[PDB]
UniProtKB/Swiss-Prot annotation, chain B:
Homotrimer. Interacts with the capsid vertex protein; this interaction binds the peripentonal hexons to the neighboring penton base. Interacts with the hexon-linking protein; this interaction tethers the hexons surrounding the penton to those situated in the central plate of the facet. Interacts with the hexon-interlacing protein; this interaction lashes the hexons together. Interacts with host dyneins DYNC1LI1 and DYNC1I2; this interaction might be involved in intracellular microtubule-dependent transport of incoming viral capsid. This is Hexon protein. Induction: Expressed in the late phase of the viral replicative cycle. All late proteins expressed from the major late promoter are produced by alternative splicing and alternative polyadenylation of the same gene giving rise to non-overlapping ORFs. A leader sequence is present in the N-terminus of all these mRNAs and is recognized by the viral shutoff protein to provide expression although conventional translation via ribosome scanning from the cap has been shut off in the host cell. Belongs to the adenoviridae hexon protein family. Major capsid protein that self-associates to form 240 hexon trimers, each in the shape of a hexagon, building most of the pseudo T=25 capsid. Assembled into trimeric units with the help of the chaperone shutoff protein. Transported by pre-protein VI to the nucleus where it associates with other structural proteins to form an empty capsid. Might be involved, through its interaction with host dyneins, in the intracellular microtubule-dependent transport of incoming viral capsid to the nucleus. The gene is L3. The chain holds residues 503 to 552 of 952 of the full protein. It is found in: Virion; Host nucleus.
Length: 50, 50, 50
């Protein structure tokens, strides 16, 4: 009785670590006196976040 | 109309009334026989042919 | 009743777009009577095709 399959919803496989295609980023903070300035923020957070 | 109407899965997702032998109040008054699992309906529809 | 599992066929999971590992390639026309020669195309076919 080939009634077909109930597969409306997609089903997905996922990386074991939640995500793997990350990339290195450096925290920055707005500059004082410049409406659109920024500086490196290495003082508090490690500059190699992913 | 009934086929191109999109219903958000969040209404009846897996985390609904866990452990509760319940019936969704919306479906209380909705006809349950008009369902594609209706065994006699399946039997007749297949008996006449596919 | 460790009756065993019916798992004859392979079961596969695929990338969301279906294709991932592509390589950029460019279109090429045959040379006009130059012994199976070839020449790059510029007929509004993208030089970067995946």
């Amino acid at each position: 009785e080939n009634h077909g399959t109930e597969d409306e919803l997609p089903n997905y496989c996922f990386p074991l670590g939640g995500v793997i295609n990350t990339e290195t980023l450096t925290k920055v903070k707005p500059k004082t006196g410049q409406e659109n300035g920024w500086e490196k923020d290495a003082t508090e957070f490690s500059d190699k976040n992913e | 109309y009934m086929n191109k109407r999109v219903v958000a899965p969040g209404l009846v997702d897996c985390y609904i009334n866990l452990g509760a032998r319940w019936s969704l109040d919306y479906m209380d008054n909705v006809n349950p026989f008009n369902h594609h699992r209706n065994a006699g309906l399946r039997y007749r529809s297949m008996l006449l042919g596919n």
